[PDB]
Copies of this chain bind each other. A is one copy, B any other.
Amino acid sequence: TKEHLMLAALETFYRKGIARTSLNEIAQAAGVTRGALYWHFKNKEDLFDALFQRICDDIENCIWTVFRHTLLHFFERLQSNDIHYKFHNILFLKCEHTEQNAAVIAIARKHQAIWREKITAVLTEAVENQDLADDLDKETAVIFIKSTLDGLIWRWFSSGESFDLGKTAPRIIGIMMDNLENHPCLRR
C-alpha cells in the first residue's frame, strides 16, 4: 500500500523537483484521492522521509573491508537500480535550498547525520584492527570521505552522466582508501 504512494512521489519528485510538486499531483500519479494519501503520509516531507528511509534500508540490508565493498556496490546501484538512481538525482539536482523546501532539507540533514555517525563508527572500529593508524584525524577523515563521495555523485549527475561511473567510481574509491590508510594530511 504505502509503497505505491512512495514510488509515485519519487516519480513526481524526479520530473518536477520537490519544490514544484504538490500532494495533489502525487495522489493523482498513484491514482488515489487526496484523502487516501493523507492517511499514510501527512505531507511531502513525510514521503521524502520514507523514501530516504528505503534507500538507507536498501544499503543496510545488503551486508573495513566491508566498507570498501559497500562503497563499490553503492555506485553500481546508482546505475542498475532505478529507485537509487532517481532518489539521488532528486537529492543532488532537484532539491533547491529555498525557504519553501526548508522542511525537506531538514529531513535530508537528519539522514545525512546518521550517515556521518555510521562512517565515524566504521573508522573508529578500523583504527583498532590496525587497518588505520592510531593518529588518524577522524574528524577530518569523515569530511574527507563524504566530500569525496559527494563530489563523484554531483559530478556524475550534473554532467548528465557524461562519463562511465562503473569505471570511474572504483578508481576514486581505491585512491580515497589509499589516502585514508597512508596520507599524512589525514593524521593529527
- Residues of A near any B CB (own CB < 8 A): 15-17, 19-20, 92-100, 109, 112, 140, 143-144, 146-152, 154-155, 157-158, 160, 163, 168, 171-172, 174-175, 178-179, 183, 185-186
Which residue of B19, B155, B174, B186 contacts A150 across the interface (Cβ within 8 Å)?
B155
Whether A98 touches B16, Cβ cut-off 8 Å, given contacts A112-B158, A140-B168, is yes
The 3 closest A-B pairs by CB, nearest first: A151-B151, A93-B97, A147-B151
Cβ of A175 and Cβ of B168 under 8 Å apart?
no
B contact residues around A186 at 8 Å (CB): 171, 175
As for how many copies of this chain the complex holds, the number is 2
B contact residues around A147 at 8 Å (CB): 148, 151-152, 154-155, 172
Contacts A94-B96, A144-B172, A171-B186 supplied; 16 other A-B pairs, CB < 8 Å: A19-B19, A19-B20, A20-B100, A96-B96, A97-B158, A140-B171, A143-B168, A144-B171, A146-B155, A147-B152, A148-B148, A150-B151, A150-B155, A150-B158, A151-B152, A171-B185
A110 CB to closest chain B CB (Å) equals: 13
B contact residues around A183 at 8 Å (CB): 175, 178
B contact residues around A17 at 8 Å (CB): 19, 96-98
Kindly report which residue of chain B lies nearest to residue A108, judged by CB atoms: B158
Cβ of A143 and Cβ of B163 under 8 Å apart?
yes
A165 CA to B186 CA, complexed, in Å? 15
A15 CA to B97 CA, complexed, in Å? 9
A113 CB to closest chain B CB (Å) equals: 10
A144 CA to B179 CA, complexed, in Å? 14
